[PDB]
Amino acid sequence: MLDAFAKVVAQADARGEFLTNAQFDALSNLVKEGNKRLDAVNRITSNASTIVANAARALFAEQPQLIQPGGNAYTNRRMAACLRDMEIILRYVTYAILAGDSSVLDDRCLNGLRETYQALGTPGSSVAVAIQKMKDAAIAIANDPNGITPGDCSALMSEIAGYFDRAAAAVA
Amino acid sequence: MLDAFAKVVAQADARGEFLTNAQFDALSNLVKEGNKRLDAVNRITSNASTIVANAARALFAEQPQLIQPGGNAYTNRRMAACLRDMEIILRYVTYAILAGDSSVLDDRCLNGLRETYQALGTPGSSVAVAIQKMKDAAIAIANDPNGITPGDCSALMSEIAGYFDRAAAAVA
Amino acid sequence: MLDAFAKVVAQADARGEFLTNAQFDALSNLVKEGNKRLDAVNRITSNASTIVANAARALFAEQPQLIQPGGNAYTNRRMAACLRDMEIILRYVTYAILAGDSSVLDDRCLNGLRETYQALGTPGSSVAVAIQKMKDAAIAIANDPNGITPGDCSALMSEIAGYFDRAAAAVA
Amino acid sequence: MKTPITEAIAAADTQGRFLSNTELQAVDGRFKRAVASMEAARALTNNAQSLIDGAAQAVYQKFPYTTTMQGSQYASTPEGKAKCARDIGYYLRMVTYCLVAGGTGPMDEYLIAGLSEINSTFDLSPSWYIEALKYIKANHGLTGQAAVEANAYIDYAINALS
Amino acid sequence: MKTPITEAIAAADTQGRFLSNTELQAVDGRFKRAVASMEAARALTNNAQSLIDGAAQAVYQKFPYTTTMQGSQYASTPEGKAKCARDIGYYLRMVTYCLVAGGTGPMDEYLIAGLSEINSTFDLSPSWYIEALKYIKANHGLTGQAAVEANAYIDYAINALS
Amino acid sequence: MKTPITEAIAAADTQGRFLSNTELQAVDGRFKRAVASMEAARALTNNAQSLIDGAAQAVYQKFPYTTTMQGSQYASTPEGKAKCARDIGYYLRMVTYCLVAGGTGPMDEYLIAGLSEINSTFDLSPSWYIEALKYIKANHGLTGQAAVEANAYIDYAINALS
Numbered sequence A, B, C: 001m002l003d004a005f006a007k008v009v010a011q012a013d014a015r016g017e018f019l020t021n022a023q024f025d026a027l028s029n030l031v032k033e034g035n036k037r038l039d040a041v042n043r044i045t046s047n048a049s050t051i052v053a054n055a056a057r058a059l060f061a062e063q064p065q066l067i068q069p070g071g072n073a074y075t076n077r078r079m080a081a082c083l084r085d086m087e088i089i090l091r092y093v094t095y096a097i098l099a100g101d102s103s104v105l106d107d108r109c110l111n112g113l114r115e116t117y118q119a120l121g122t123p124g125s126s127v128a129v130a131i132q133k134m135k136d137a138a139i140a141i142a143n144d145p146n147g148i149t150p151g152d153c154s155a156l157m158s159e160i161a162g163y164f165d166r167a168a169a170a171v172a
Numbered sequence D, E, F: 001m002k003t004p005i006t007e008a009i010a011a012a013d014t015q016g017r018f019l020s021n022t023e024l025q026a027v028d029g030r031f032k033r034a035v036a037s038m039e040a041a042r043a044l045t046n047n048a049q050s051l052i053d054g055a056a057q058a059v060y061q062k063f064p065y066t067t068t069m070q071g072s073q074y075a076s077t078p079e080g081k082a083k084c085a086r087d088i089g090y091y092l093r094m095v096t097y098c099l100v101a102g103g104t105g106p107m108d109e110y111l112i113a114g115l116s117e118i119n120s121t122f123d124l125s126p127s128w129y130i131e132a133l134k135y136i137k138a139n140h141g142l143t144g145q146a147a148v149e150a151n152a153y154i155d156y157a158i159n160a161l162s
């Protein structure tokens, strides 16, 4: 598993190369902004149960077929399995937010996911909706201008949205 | 309704406290970004018709089911409804930008709006899409570097993002 | 396993008590001394290999019967194990130094060790000598006044001799 | 809470319109005036204990019966003197709050609404508080437009008391 | 018990490794954060009784039935009031402990382990304890990173209950 | 690759738990240490050719038989002198990589795993590299915590060869 610093380290090693100042600066500016990355993880994690539960309620409100008898999310075992997937995906996304690199989400969560859903008949389209709803909730919470020193979280928020869209693409 | 300053004051009253010398410094900083805040509001407002109509056109191109007969935005009465909502949300976003605080958007626009659409049969998902398109257009316009004294508006644009993010979160 | 803070918390919970200012103050004082604690672990750890080898060499010179044929440290397998044991004890002592609490050392290293030696035939008195050598070397290295901001680490060096003598007591 | 910004927003929302230049200009005036009003709020905050104790003393010297008349509503006891000093700092604190907000809102919401019911119910006379406010105006040592700002919110409370 | 210091040691112990620079950084981060943490912990310990009472009243108020329904599980008797207030103190004592340790370990071990089993067996609704913690979050008085520290372990309890 | 951040993540994942405050403290400690770390890495990188050329000559001076004894494994040849310099730059590069990552990871994966196998197989002796590392320590010019950071990782390499 790589964090953002290890990713640059590994790319330089494959070339046999010390780092350049462009690379030093890059990473060092990443550090300088680090408090914002901690607030984002703290904010999404601290609200995970709400993010999952509202996203799930929204999804089944939009796609009622999922919870009709016979629906892929009907019965309590399949509903809880759905909710579990929603927490797991949110979990691995926040891991990636902390790392600054997709690799932990990619290796331990996304790889093989689409084939998994294609195997159980779970509609990956609908998983994708659930992921986009969690994305909108998480970005609102993390980017919430209330209750935090004001500053520019914009590059970071584009990164977070990146990880969520990457999940959504992966499951459908 | 609170603006940024009124919020600091109401937080301090609940404590029975005068403001700190640190807090006053923080407030000087708000005052200093004054001109940029006005630019952003002027710029978004002066282009509101375009922002709304381009966003709505893009939405109906992506989601033609909305304008199929039977669709939620079919009939001129419903289409006008839809554009009115878009207009309203943007108006309330622009108010939050003037205020430097989300409370006017949250109290007069967002609170109860998910339940409203759920009850109407309006797909909040699609509404969130219209809000994201208005978002990307508004920020591009407010942060357009031509025809303005050059400088750095990144924080202000981070904050503006936050108000759109709340909006889009709130409608599913 | 507990650290100094968790031990106080575990004491307090057994009584259903919030902490007293006594304890708050004590733990706060450990935190302001924390830089020294980190210097000591890094210093001992960065010299681990030579602390162990010098101590082993010194033990065998005082106790050549251990390496005569038939002795406990004779053959390379037994020599490796003795050296290993020395590394293991030192490492857990350094865990205890970081934690500010002997519990990790007690639970995971010292508990049952005396009986293990009695079983195998290993002279625990000689292990205690080996441990007391590593202590003298480790403290002298941790408390070297060269290449470090000057100050008094006497309180800490006493704590550290604490963990070595505890360990030596437990095998002897 | 009334401030120049919430008035501007409240204007346009009542008419269901976007903000216009009409409202942006008013907010700009508020940003411009903030230099002087935050100087005033800081100076009063920094000097607050002495202003408060000095105001209380001005009240007692002007109305000495407040320190001798027997009754919970008077400062004739250790506790009535604490109550009074407390109230006077409330007043000063709300002036600083108006200055920070750029408007009467904080004082309007937290103090003036209900003011006269409370003074009547609890037999507190408005003239006591007016003298304390006069004392504060006379001794905050501010100058220039920072003075003008502080005095505007003090004379506003005095009006409310009259 | 889980703290940043035990996680660090546990990490190295599990690789049978001496501590490295990787781990000492974690401990220094904890040492620096302890300033906000220990401050939040002291504040809630000082204000404990009032947060606890305020919290129970907040709960009895959002769930009026908890005080009318007969049933040993309800605060509809003096015994159930004392059970409920005892419980709320337990939650608060657990936040304080997490602040002192710099981690969730104490709450995990002493309250979250088996939490679901108890609330089910004894018919205690999670919503009640969640309201209580919401009240504590809203009324502890903290600002800055001390507040951040208290609400993280409060929101962690809320999550556990959700 | 072992860093303070991947280790914090690894700990949560092993327990199936979202990240907690426990872990965020670890990473903050990493971020604050990173100031010293990249200074040292910058200084070592900017002056690597000197450190490398001087650490090689340092080994030759202490083990001058490595300059003359016949064999592949010796810096007896041009090719050998070039290998030795190559190896030393590898250790230096890895030291800088650890400073960038704030942990032993890069050195562990790229150099230490298999280290004993390679030195035994190609009859290279650890004390050779130990002396080169001693030289780097002695001449990086670093001061303050930048120096403590560099030497932590240089001593780690040395421990590994011992």
Ligand SMILES: *[C@@H](C)[C@H]1C(Cc2[nH]c(Cc3[nH]c(/C=C4\NC(=O)C(CC)=C4C)c(C)c3CCC(=O)O)c(CCC(=O)O)c2C)=NC(=O)[C@@H]1C
Pocket (backbone or CB within 6 Å): A032, A033, A034, A035, A036, A037, A038, A039, A040, A042, A142, A143, A144, A145, A148, A149, A150, A151, A152, A153, B158, B159, B162, E033, E144, E145, E148, F021, F024, F025, F028
């Ligand atoms: C985008 C995420 C939003 C922000 C973020 C933002 N935060 C800060 C300051 C800041 N954040 C922390 C938080 C932590 N430090 C830790 O060690 C941990 C883990 C326990 C956390 C959660 C601190 C300590 C600070 C500095 C103190 C302060 O309150 O200022 C800033 C200021 C700049 C900076 O320090 O990087 C910003 C911009 N603000 C927004 O407007 C975005 C919505």
Ligand SMILES: *[C@@H](C)[C@H]1C(Cc2[nH]c(Cc3[nH]c(/C=C4\NC(=O)C(CC)=C4C)c(C)c3CCC(=O)O)c(CCC(=O)O)c2C)=NC(=O)[C@@H]1C
Pocket (backbone or CB within 6 Å): B032, B033, B035, B036, B037, B038, B039, B040, B042, B142, B143, B144, B145, B148, B149, B150, B151, B152, B153, D021, D024, D025, D028
């Ligand atoms: C990000 C928004 C882009 C900026 C903004 C920017 N503006 C200024 C100066 C500036 N802006 C105004 C505008 C107004 N003053 C008012 O009262 C009103 C309401 C009718 C408006 C619209 C003024 C008067 C000024 C000062 C004079 C000038 O024209 O320069 C700056 C300069 C710094 C500052 O004052 O903060 C900047 C940087 N420029 C960019 O490049 C961003 C994309």
Ligand SMILES: *[C@@H](C)[C@H]1C(Cc2[nH]c(Cc3[nH]c(/C=C4\NC(=O)C(CC)=C4C)c(C)c3CCC(=O)O)c(CCC(=O)O)c2C)=NC(=O)[C@@H]1C
Pocket (backbone or CB within 6 Å): C032, C033, C034, C035, C036, C037, C038, C039, C040, C042, C142, C143, C144, C145, C146, C148, C149, C150, C151, C152, C153, C156, E021, E024, E025, E028, F033, F144, F145, F148
């Ligand atoms: C007895 C142990 C000797 C002392 C120790 C001593 N150190 C300091 C300051 C000090 N130590 C560090 C070390 C670290 N901080 C970290 O995060 C890590 C892990 C990566 C380490 C290894 C730092 C950063 C500092 C602060 C900066 C400085 O160099 O001063 C002091 C000063 C007092 C204090 O900071 O507590 C002392 C006294 N000095 C002696 O003379 C004893 C032999």
Ligand SMILES: *[C@H](C)[C@H]1C(Cc2[nH]c(Cc3[nH]c(/C=C4\NC(=O)C(CC)=C4C)c(C)c3CCC(=O)O)c(CCC(=O)O)c2C)=NC(=O)[C@@H]1C
Pocket (backbone or CB within 6 Å): A066, A071, A072, A073, A077, A078, A079, A081, A082, A083, A085, A086, A088, A089, A108, A109, A113, A116, A120, A122, A123, A126, A127, A130
């Ligand atoms: C909810 C948004 C949607 C679901 C989800 C759903 N999933 C399953 C089974 C299921 N899900 C996974 C996912 C993962 N396992 C992992 O280890 C990881 C990463 C660590 C992930 C992301 C697996 C492996 C499985 C199969 C095993 C199991 O069910 O326990 C179900 C139930 C399948 C069934 O009962 O046939 C469901 C319902 N379904 C929807 O309709 C929502 C769109």
Ligand SMILES: *[C@H](C)[C@H]1C(Cc2[nH]c(Cc3[nH]c(/C=C4\NC(=O)C(CC)=C4C)c(C)c3CCC(=O)O)c(CCC(=O)O)c2C)=NC(=O)[C@@H]1C
Pocket (backbone or CB within 6 Å): B066, B071, B072, B073, B077, B078, B079, B081, B082, B083, B085, B086, B088, B089, B108, B109, B113, B116, B120, B122, B123, B126, B127, B130
């Ligand atoms: C457009 C992108 C999407 C719509 C929107 C749509 N909305 C409605 C009705 C509607 N919208 C609101 C929202 C508000 N009323 C307020 O006062 C405020 C804040 C001031 C808000 C945000 C309300 C209350 C209503 C009901 C009132 C009405 O119908 O006029 C409709 C029409 C519903 C109908 O006539 O059946 C539509 C179509 N529809 C889409 O398809 C787009 C995704």
Ligand SMILES: *[C@H](C)[C@H]1C(Cc2[nH]c(Cc3[nH]c(/C=C4\NC(=O)C(CC)=C4C)c(C)c3CCC(=O)O)c(CCC(=O)O)c2C)=NC(=O)[C@@H]1C
Pocket (backbone or CB within 6 Å): C066, C071, C072, C073, C077, C078, C079, C081, C082, C083, C085, C086, C088, C089, C108, C109, C110, C113, C116, C120, C122, C123, C126, C127, C130
């Ligand atoms: C060296 C200074 C002295 C010895 C040491 C010696 N020990 C052993 C075997 C031995 N030591 C342990 C101790 C531990 N195992 C653990 O996992 C832990 C912490 C988790 C500890 C503290 C064990 C369990 C064993 C038996 C297992 C094994 O040998 O692999 C020997 C081997 C004796 C033999 O093989 O017959 C020796 C030589 N001997 C001396 O003379 C020194 C005083």
Ligand SMILES: *[C@H](C)[C@H]1C(Cc2[nH]c(Cc3[nH]c(/C=C4\NC(=O)C(CC)=C4C)c(C)c3CCC(=O)O)c(CCC(=O)O)c2C)=NC(=O)[C@@H]1C
Pocket (backbone or CB within 6 Å): D059, D060, D066, D067, D071, D072, D073, D074, D075, D076, D079, D080, D081, D083, D084, D085, D087, D088, D090, D091, D110, D111, D118, D122, D124, D128, D129, D132
């Ligand atoms: C001081 C100039 C003179 C006093 C003062 C005095 N006041 C009271 C009671 C009192 N004061 C208030 C005022 C406020 N409550 C608010 O919330 C606000 C706005 C933030 C204000 C200005 C109230 C509501 C009350 C009654 C309730 C209470 O005790 O707090 C007393 C004691 C009253 C009594 O118990 O009888 C006194 C003595 N009296 C003098 O003689 C001084 C000149």
Ligand SMILES: *[C@H](C)[C@H]1C(Cc2[nH]c(Cc3[nH]c(/C=C4\NC(=O)C(CC)=C4C)c(C)c3CCC(=O)O)c(CCC(=O)O)c2C)=NC(=O)[C@@H]1C
Pocket (backbone or CB within 6 Å): E059, E060, E066, E067, E071, E072, E073, E074, E075, E076, E079, E080, E081, E083, E084, E085, E087, E088, E090, E091, E110, E111, E118, E122, E124, E128, E129, E132
């Ligand atoms: C208060 C918000 C609401 C209650 C409270 C209530 N609790 C109980 C019994 C009860 N509570 C616990 C909780 C804990 N025990 C622990 O050890 C810990 C961690 C340290 C916790 C959080 C337990 C285990 C029990 C049952 C065992 C016991 O009696 O102590 C009652 C009475 C239940 C009964 O006797 O049947 C009540 C009333 N009920 C409400 O209505 C309040 C809203």
Ligand SMILES: *[C@H](C)[C@H]1C(Cc2[nH]c(Cc3[nH]c(/C=C4\NC(=O)C(CC)=C4C)c(C)c3CCC(=O)O)c(CCC(=O)O)c2C)=NC(=O)[C@@H]1C
Pocket (backbone or CB within 6 Å): F059, F060, F066, F067, F072, F073, F074, F075, F076, F079, F080, F081, F083, F084, F085, F087, F088, F090, F091, F110, F111, F118, F122, F124, F128, F129, F132
């Ligand atoms: C220099 C201090 C002394 C040497 C140097 C020397 N080394 C070799 C061969 C050699 N070195 C390595 C080391 C590494 N390979 C890696 O991938 C890494 C981490 C990235 C390291 C540290 C290896 C694996 C090898 C063997 C394979 C190869 O040739 O690359 C030689 C030549 C050995 C031979 O040809 O038999 C020499 C001379 N010897 C001295 O006398 C110097 C004092």
